[PDB]
Write a protein that binds this ligand. Structure first.
Ligand SMILES: NCCCC[C@H](NC(=O)[C@@H](N)CCCNC(N)=[NH2+])C(=O)O
Ligand SMILES: NCCCC[C@H](NC(=O)[C@@H](N)CCCNC(N)=[NH2+])C(=O)O
Ligand SMILES: [Mg+2]
Ligand SMILES: [Mg+2]
Lengths: 354, 354
């Protein structure tokens, strides 16, 4: 199939809804858009959203790694050799997982078009659709319930709530919300490293009481020893996010005694579908459930993540809302949202429309 | 691309060279041959050689799992959906890994032909070629040297020597063999679960002194705890065979403290290329070396093992001699032997010829 050409550009996306995360805040996001064209005319798409506090990858570095000069070795390479290409991406873009993921997506986009089916069918289909959470950032009780209701009306059945580590505020938000929802959506929480050992045992008791489904990354990334020191049943209700970048992390967390029961895979953390799939093999073997999450991102990479997600039997949760609050985007299609569930189209490849 | 027909038959192959394994003694072999034709005329090939003592799969059970009536679910299925098809093989033939492999093989053969490249390039190429060992069964000192010399003459640079557990005979054979070869070939050994703990330490001292590359399965398959009680440096020179069936075993042996340093993968154990590649992912992350082994088998499955092996960066060794001593076969091609080294032809798919 033969790569002819590659274009890379910066795109600025302001958010319709700015929000707060633990020791942070976000009004807008930059992505890198990648276009890979085939000798015979086909177009693969990819998108990068580097997260520096997690992977160490700056936007400057991401863009650097995608510079036209540094990509020459891809010219004229045969996309049917995709897994070899993915290995070489890992070797030539060792420090830029988001950049690497962008190219990786695009190649998966093209190989599926070559074969003639939606990418998911090519990776083998484990699922037709799944519910996705939408995110509520850090904010006071009234505002929280206010956003909660907006989301219910847009038809979402799952809410992901960010916690700040102040137990008084965190707990009252969760109790009020549980009340206000009256069983209309389930809830998952994300303290984002802000808790401590005694704190989490407390939060976990609430979580059981309120029927919250799991707790995402309660302790600091390096603190996985704190996780293993918890009773096994509590560990099953905890997901690793910032602790989990690639397959090496997956294996280390999965090794007995296992650190947790859920992995949150993000393309921008691991560097594309190929490494994400290695994570899934490890997780499935270890009896660990997969959650597919994201950064603030164009529909392009959300779609890529969805196709991967629906191809893994171990996939259980989706947190795929990264493109919803974008003020504009550079592509349409790739997935369909209906009544809170995410689905792919019947179009070949990623199914994106330019 | 749409499966159209599936045909299955028993073939009886006598050996040109009968041989003894610890507790066993083989004079001939039966294989099941599997032909999958596409609606467009394309032909996939697979071969099953069930090993009952290792997998519990008998020839009868294997044949039964391939009955034309038990295979109806595959008709009309699209081979471009291969990973999904393989997941189903696992559900529908859970107790018959050889039969599963035979179908898995054939399907990979077709997807590769669909794309139009040798299977190995579709899987992404990690290697051009590797040396293979040839096997010397249990037999006295003189006949061992005689067989070694026959093999040197045919150009092999690596010999795999079966040990029986009797140290006086085992050690004498290895010492003599070392002397007879000059540097002409490296030697690897395979006690097949016949050693105890005190004896293995004795064997390992010899192995270091004689420059033998490693020891395959010194202990009973269930005695994994004996491995972990060894110093790490010794564990690195040990390969797992009968202890390793599928990915579940792979993870178990790989998790810290790791039981051994090398996995011996066999399609007839794990159930085909799909599970085999799952083992490879685990092994690579754990820093375990891969060796691809076999039973007495037609070129068909040897070829398939070869494509898979040349596609995994973790592969360090081949023991692929399973089709050499067959008095007849049903196919040609698929791999080329030169000067002890195995390599694949340039033809698409498995590259077999009828
Ligand atoms: N660096 C991204 C911040 C959040 C990451 C993630 N939580 C989420 O809920 C993501 N879906 C956030 C990105 C989606 N966009 C919006 N506006 N919520 C995490 O678990 O760390
Ligand atoms: N129970 C497994 C039977 C084979 C044993 C295998 N040893 C080998 O040497 C393999 N290459 C088998 C094929 C050898 N074929 C001939 N004709 N010598 C093992 O590792 O247990
Ligand atoms: Mg998190
Ligand atoms: Mg063995």
């Amino acid at each position: 199939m033969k790569i002819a050409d590659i274009q890379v550009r910066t795109e600025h996306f302001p958010l319709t809804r700015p929000y707060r995360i633990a020791f942070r805040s976000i009004e807008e996001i930059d992505n890198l858009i990648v276009e890979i064209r085939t000798a015979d005319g086909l177009l693969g798409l990819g998108a990068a959203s580097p997260e520096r506090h997690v992977t160490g990858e700056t936007l400057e570095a991401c863009h650097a790694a995608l510079d036209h000069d540094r990509l020459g070795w891809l010219m004229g390479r045969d996309i049917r050799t995709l897994p070899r290409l993915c290995r070489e991406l890992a070797e030539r873009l060792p420090a830029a997982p988001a950049a690497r993921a962008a190219l990786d997506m695009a190649l998966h986009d093209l190989v599926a078009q070559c074969l003639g089916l939606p990418l998911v069918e090519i990776l083998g289909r484990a699922h037709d659709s799944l519910p996705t959470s939408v995110t509520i950032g850090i904010k006071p009780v009234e505002e929280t319930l206010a956003e909660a209701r907006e989301h219910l009306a847009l038809g979402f059945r799952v809410l992901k709530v960010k916690l700040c580590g102040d137990e008084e505020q965190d707990f009252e938000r969760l109790r009020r919300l549980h009340e206000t929802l009256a069983g209309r959506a389930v809830v998952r929480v994300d303290p984002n490293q802000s808790y401590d050992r005694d704190g989490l045992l407390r939060l976990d008791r609430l979580v059981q009481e309120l029927g919250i489904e799991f707790i995402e990354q309660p302790f600091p990334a390096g603190r996985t020893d704190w996780l293993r020191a918890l009773p096994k049943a509590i560990r099953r209700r905890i997901a690793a996010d910032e602790s989990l970048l690639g397959p090496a992390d997956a294996f280390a967390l999965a090794a007995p005694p296992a650190a947790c029961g859920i992995f949150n895979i993000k393309l921008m953390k691991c560097g594309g579908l190929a490494p994400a799939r290695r994570i899934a093999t490890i997780a499935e073997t270890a009896g660990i459930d997969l959650m597919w999450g994201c950064m603030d991102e164009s529909r392009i990479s959300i779609a890529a993540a969805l196709h991967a997600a629906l191809a893994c039997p171990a996939t259980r949760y989706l947190d795929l809302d990264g493109s919803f609050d974008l003020a504009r985007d550079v592509a349409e299609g790739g997935f369909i949202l209906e009544d809170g569930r995410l689905r792919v189209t019947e179009r070949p490849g990623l199914g994106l429309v330019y």
